[PDB]
DNA sequence: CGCCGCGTCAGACTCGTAGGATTATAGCATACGTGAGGTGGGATGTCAAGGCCTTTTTTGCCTAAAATGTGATCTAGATCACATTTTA
């Protein structure tokens, strides 16, 4: 599953590899959200998988950029 | 053996001049801890009157005793117009 959907991970990743942090870190975090979605996904919902891990990936990257990527940590609320 | 290609590595010295950055990234719910706020409470620190001792300020006082007064009786100084008289 994971080795299959790596291209989803990288595709979504490089929408956000504008000069925020760096490519490969967005990619790696994307693989983390991917592994979550593989751990959680239900076939019985019968939907496509792409959407599910799209959400999960996007969460993971979207707050790893914010936790990291600065010398001064601004937490999520600000 | 002797190229050839690729790569590594230095490029003078002291002063001055200016301020200075930027893109876009979801959203709400749970639940937990830490910062700025209260809060009585030991405990410390202050400020105004009183009891131990010595010193200081009044102040007794203690007797040597030298000093302070009594006043009629004197005394040895002190004067002034005339008559010379001396000395530089």
From Swiss-Prot:
- In residue numbers, the region (Sigma-70 factor domain-2) covers 1-71
Q: Where found, per UniProt?
A: Cytoplasm
The portions of this protein that span the membrane are none
Domain of life of the organism encoding this protein: Bacteria
Question: Coordinates of motif Interaction with polymerase core subunit RpoC in the sequence?
Answer: 25-28
Q: Reproduce the free-text note on domains from the UniProt record.
A: Contains 4 domains, connected by flexible linkers. In the active conformation, the domains are in an extended conformation, each making extensive interactions with the RNA polymerase catalytic core. In the autoinhibited state, sigma-70 factor domain-1 packs closely together with sigma-70 factor domains-2 and -4, contrary to the extended conformation that is seen when the protein is part of the RNA polymerase holoenzyme.
What the record says about family reads: Belongs to the sigma-70 factor family. RpoD/SigA subfamily.
Function in brief: Sigma factors are initiation factors that promote the attachment of RNA polymerase to specific initiation sites and are then released. This sigma factor is the primary sigma factor during exponential growth. Preferentially transcribes genes associated with fast growth, such as ribosomal operons, other protein-synthesis related genes, rRNA- and tRNA-encoding genes and prfB.
Subunit text: Interacts transiently with the RNA polymerase catalytic core formed by RpoA, RpoB, RpoC and RpoZ (2 alpha, 1 beta, 1 beta' and 1 omega subunit) to form the RNA polymerase holoenzyme that can initiate transcription. Identified in a complex containing RpoD, the RNA polymerase subunits RpoA, RpoB and RpoZ, CRP and DNA. Interacts with Rsd; this prevents interaction with the RNA polymerase catalytic core and with promoter DNA, and as a consequence, promotes transcription from promoters that require alternative sigma factors. (Microbial infection) Interacts with Escherichia phage lambda antitermination protein Q.
Q: What is this protein called?
A: RNA polymerase sigma factor RpoD
Q: Which residues of the full protein are shown?
A: 379 to 456 of 613
């Amino acid at each position: 599953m994971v080795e299959a959907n790596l291209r989803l991970v990288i595709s979504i990743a490089k929408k956000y590899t504008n000069r925020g942090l760096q490519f490969l870190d967005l990619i790696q975090e994307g693989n983390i959200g991917l592994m979550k979605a593989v751990d959680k996904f239900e076939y019985r919902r019968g939907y496509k998988f792409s959407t599910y891990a799209t959400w999960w990936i996007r969460q993971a990257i979207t707050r790893s950029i914010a936790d990291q990527a600065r010398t001064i940590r601004i937490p999520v609320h600000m």
